[PDB]
Amino acid sequence: GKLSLQDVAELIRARACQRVVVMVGAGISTPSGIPDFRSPGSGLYSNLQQYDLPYPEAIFELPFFFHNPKPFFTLAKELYPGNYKPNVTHYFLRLLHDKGLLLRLYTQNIDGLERVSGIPASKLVEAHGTFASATCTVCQRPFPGEDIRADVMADRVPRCPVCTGVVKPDIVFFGEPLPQRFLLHVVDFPMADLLLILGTSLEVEPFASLTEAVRSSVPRLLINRDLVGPLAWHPRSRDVAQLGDVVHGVESLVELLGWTEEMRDLVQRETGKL
Ligand SMILES: [Zn+2]
């Protein structure tokens, strides 16, 4: 006796699941046009070859930042809040929160679109960082993202007002440790009664183990093109796959919840405010 997408949809309507924990990846955002800087062809990829990086991933290396910050900041300009807007996927999660069901949303994305869709900070774990804030590389003072917005959009490298050091946005670089809020997972996953995995393979650790971190009786809804990861290898009876386009699978569950109108309604107000 498996479950189906409607099954879950009805567990949320009946509110037999009311402490939902969601995990999202790159897949929920490419609908909003977030360009993969890794993939050639995208505009951002083009601008990055202009420099002397040995590979695209070296923007996220501290060495090949303090050597030249400009490559990173080229990404920074492209992703900096406002330039893109959230899609139906983020908004389902916005809604899921407003309806009081959202325990925590753990994201691997840096587009901060979870923020913009209107989910409060307390609900978010931006495990790979955010452009929302920054920190002086030298004097360690933090800065709200607006202060470096001026220099960033104008291709200048923002130096600190007190000491003139580089003000690096709070993006997690390879090698630096994951943000402190990631450690909420000790309490969130044991209290989660529903796990929701959208648009990512959960292949990189330590997120891969988190999927097995809900109690056994908890259903895990996956919505992704493929079926891989700890959901493929070690599945559970309570699991539900929704393979294919994420946007579509999101809409199908918004339907089966009967929210499809309330969703179009949210999409209305929040598109105007942007
Ligand atoms: Zn400083």
Side-chain angles (χ1 to χ4, degrees), residues 37 73 83 99 111 119 128 165 217 238 248 259 270 273:
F37 77 106
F73 275 109
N83 288 109
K99 302 195 89 74
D111 55 50
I119 312 173
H128 279 63
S217 61
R238 298 294 297 164
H248 171 64
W259 299 352
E270 302 290 18
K273 290 170 194 161

Side-chain angles (χ1 to χ4, degrees), residues 136 139 160 163:
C136 182
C139 84
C160 173
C163 68

Side-chain angles (χ1 to χ4, degrees), residues 136 138-141 160 162-165:
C136 182
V138 164
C139 84
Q140 315 307 324
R141 284 176 170 82
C160 173
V162 175
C163 68
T164 74

Side-chain angles (χ1 to χ4, degrees), residues 80-81 132 143-150:
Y80 213 77
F143 286 80
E146 283 54 70
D147 313 339
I148 57 169
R149 186 178 178 88

Side-chain angles (χ1 to χ4, degrees), residues 30-265:
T30 50
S32 294
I34 298 293
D36 184 29
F37 77 106
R38 272 187 222 88
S39 159
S42 61
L44 175 52
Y45 184 90
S46 301
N47 307 310
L48 293 187
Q49 312 175 286
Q50 194 201 317
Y51 307 95
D52 208 33
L53 291 175
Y55 42 90
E57 281 79 8
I59 64 179
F60 289 153
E61 292 182 8
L62 284 173
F64 282 70
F65 174 95
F66 290 120
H67 173 56
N68 182 10
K70 269 181 279 273
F72 175 83
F73 275 109
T74 305
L75 174 85
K77 179 184 168 179
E78 191 66 37
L79 298 175
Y80 213 77
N83 288 109
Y84 302 181
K85 285 187 213 178
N87 67 78
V88 59
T89 306
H90 300 90
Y91 278 111
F92 166 72
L93 303 171
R94 163 59 195 278
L95 195 41
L96 198 39
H97 158 64
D98 291 322
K99 302 195 89 74
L101 301 166
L102 181 52
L103 178 43
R104 201 90 57 207
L105 171 55
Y106 290 80
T107 186
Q108 308 184 73
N109 296 333
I110 62 190
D111 55 50
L113 287 167
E114 300 76 24
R115 296 293 298 153
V116 166
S117 81
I119 312 173
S122 63
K123 291 317 183 59
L124 298 180
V125 179
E126 289 167 341
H128 279 63
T130 188
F131 300 86
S133 58
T135 305
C136 182
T137 48
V138 164
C139 84
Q140 315 307 324
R141 284 176 170 82
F143 286 80
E146 283 54 70
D147 313 339
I148 57 169
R149 186 178 178 88
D151 309 285
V152 167
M153 291 309 211
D155 295 333
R156 282 186 324 280
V157 173
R159 299 172 52 154
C160 173
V162 175
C163 68
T164 74
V166 187
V167 192
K168 169 169 97 66
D170 287 317
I171 295 307
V172 188
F173 280 32
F174 295 151
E176 282 178 338
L178 287 180
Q180 290 159 359
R181 282 186 48 74
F182 178 81
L183 287 164
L184 284 164
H185 77 92
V186 189
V187 289
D188 280 352
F189 282 67
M191 289 173 71
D193 59 13
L194 174 71
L195 190 63
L196 196 51
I197 302 147
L198 324 177
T200 189
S201 48
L202 284 188
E203 276 170 358
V204 73
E205 285 270 342
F207 308 70
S209 300
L210 296 177
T211 77
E212 292 181 350
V214 302
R215 279 148 311 141
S216 51
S217 61
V218 176
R220 312 183 281 177
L221 175 44
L222 165 61
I223 300 169
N224 192 0
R225 325 167 156 176
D226 293 332
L227 181 48
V228 292
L231 266 66
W233 188 258
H234 274 124
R236 303 173 175 182
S237 45
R238 298 294 297 164
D239 293 7
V240 173
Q242 181 62 33
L243 297 178
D245 184 353
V246 175
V247 180
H248 171 64
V250 167
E251 273 160 359
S252 297
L253 169 62
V254 174
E255 193 52 57
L256 303 182
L257 285 164
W259 299 352
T260 183
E261 186 53 18
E262 192 176 348
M263 256 291 308
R264 182 268 178 190
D265 274 31

